[PDB]
């Protein structure tokens, strides 16, 4: 044997391993190394637009801390 | 008594699915009116601040209106923490 079913099953597992993990990595890669912001409502979108506007680079994921208020 | 007992026994022996469906439906209909926690659910819904609380203009005649969030006046959710 029955364990001879295990190889093929394992193969399928590896395939199903690829998508989700891939998405996670890509989100981090394109989002500055942190999870991509979720904007289900207009307030979150307004926050993201404000971060993009004040970044100075046109990237919402560039964060400005207390070092920018002189 | 005996008539409804025989009817319920026949229904349980023959259509248990319908008996379970009617039991669950009747419980769902009648139980919420007997529950003490429904008012708590209403209060929890009422206490969620979806929109901005617009301040009132002080006229010197509002003893029950706080002048700051941390003032003792106004609604308090000490009850919600312990729930």
């Amino acid at each position: 044997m029955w364990f001879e079913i295990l190889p093929g099953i394992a193969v399928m597992a590896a395939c199903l391993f690829i998508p989700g993990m891939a998405t996670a990595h890509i989100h981090k890669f394109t989002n500055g190394g942190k999870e991509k912001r979720v904007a289900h409502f207009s307030y979150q979108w307004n926050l993201m637009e404000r971060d993009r506007r004040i970044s100075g680079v046109n990237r919402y994921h560039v964060t400005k801390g207390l070092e920018n208020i002189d | 008594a005996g008539r409804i007992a025989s009817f319920l026994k026949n229904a349980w022996a023959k259509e248990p699915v319908l008996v379970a469906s009617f039991a669950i439906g009747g419980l769902a209909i009648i139980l919420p009116s007997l529950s003490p926690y429904t008012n708590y659910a209403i209060r929890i819904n009422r206490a969620t601040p979806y929109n901005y609380p617009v301040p009132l203009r002080d006229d010197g005649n509002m003893p029950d209106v706080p002048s700051h969030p941390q003032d003792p006046q106004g609604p308090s959710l000490e009850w919600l923490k312990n729930l």
């Binding site: 404000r50 506007r53 004040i54 | 979806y50 929109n51």
Partner: protein, 105 residues
């Protein structure tokens, strides 16, 4: 023809939905709340025949808010003149109107 049962019994069967300035959920306002409020307060109690005349300005403002025809006409005229000036080179759009604006929060 119209048996006003709601008014007689104070029932409010469907009056809550007739206008856009009537107690929306979560106090979410209509797009033209102020114009319609002004028109309704102007036209209240004086009858339809008189309201069609003495409250025409408020109704016109409400219709303009609803459909925005005159605003589109003004914008179209401004854009047409902008295109005409740009084509022959008399006017150049400023940097902040071409995507090089210094943005603000």
């Amino acid at each position: 023809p119209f048996f006003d049962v709601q008014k007689r019994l104070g029932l409010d069967l469907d009056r809550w939905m007739t206008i856009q300035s009537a107690e929306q959920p979560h106090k979410i306002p209509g797009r033209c709340h102020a114009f319609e409020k002004e028109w309704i307060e102007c036209a209240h109690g004086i009858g339809g025949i008189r309201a069609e005349k003495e409250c025409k300005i408020e109704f016109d403002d409400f219709v303009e808010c609803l459909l925005r025809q005159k605003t589109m006409k003004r914008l179209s005229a401004i854009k047409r003149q902008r295109d005409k000036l740009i084509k022959e080179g008399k006017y150049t759009p400023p940097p902040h109107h071409l995507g090089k604006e210094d943005p603000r929060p």
